[PDB]
Design an enzyme around this catalytic site. Structure first.
Site, PDB file in Angstrom:
ATOM      1  N   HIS A  12       0.753  -1.255   0.000  1.00 55.00           N
ATOM      2  CA  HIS A  12       0.000   0.000   0.000  1.00 55.00           C
ATOM      3  C   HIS A  12       0.780   1.300   0.000  1.00 55.00           C
ATOM      4  O   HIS A  12       0.180   2.359   0.109  1.00 55.00           O
ATOM      5  CB  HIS A  12      -1.029   0.019   1.140  1.00 55.00           C
ATOM      6  N   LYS A  39      -4.930  -9.644  -7.538  1.00 54.51           N
ATOM      7  CA  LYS A  39      -5.748  -8.973  -6.559  1.00 54.51           C
ATOM      8  C   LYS A  39      -6.755  -8.106  -7.300  1.00 54.51           C
ATOM      9  O   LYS A  39      -6.424  -7.420  -8.256  1.00 54.51           O
ATOM     10  CB  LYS A  39      -4.868  -8.171  -5.617  1.00 54.51           C
ATOM     11  N   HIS A 113      -3.125  -2.156   8.051  1.00 58.22           N
ATOM     12  CA  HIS A 113      -4.222  -2.528   7.179  1.00 58.22           C
ATOM     13  C   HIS A 113      -4.765  -1.301   6.486  1.00 58.22           C
ATOM     14  O   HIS A 113      -4.910  -0.279   7.140  1.00 58.22           O
ATOM     15  CB  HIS A 113      -5.346  -3.185   8.019  1.00 58.22           C
TER      16      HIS A 113
END
Length: 121
Positions: A12, A39, A113
């Site tokens: 990310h 993904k 996350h």
């Protein structure tokens, strides 16, 4: 164990990307190990890493929903969305650049996350 933070960055964070076009997405998703299987959607945050880490403090974050944090500052982002099709490579992607705050979860003061839901659009 900072492995979930490092994995968050792998999945990310891309500091200074250049073009954030479809080909960028196809290349970064391969480089960061997100193509076996393909993904479906994945967003990368750009800019300076300290601003991302700060989301986990009052310095750059608010509580969000049940157990997440939402940033006070906005970030340059690129969302890579799978075009079609198959769950195995080659994985084709469409890029959508944006600029907005982000939602993370923190553990031990570090982002671990990214909530992708705000980038489904």
């Amino acid at each position: 164990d900072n492995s979930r933070y490092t994995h968050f960055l792998t999945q990310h964070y891309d500091a200074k990307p250049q073009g954030r076009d479809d080909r960028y997405c196809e290349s970064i998703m391969r480089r960061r190990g997100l193509t076996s299987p393909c993904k479906d959607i994945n967003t990368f945050i750009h800019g300076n890493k300290r601003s991302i880490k700060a989301i986990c403090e009052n310095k750059n974050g608010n509580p969000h929903r049940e157990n997440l944090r939402i940033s006070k500052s906005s970030f340059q982002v690129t969302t890579c969305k799978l075009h079609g099709g198959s769950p195995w490579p080659p994985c084709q992607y469409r890029a959508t650049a944006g600029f907005r705050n982000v939602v993370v979860a923190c553990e031990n003061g570090l982002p671990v996350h990214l909530d992708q839901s705000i980038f489904r659009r």
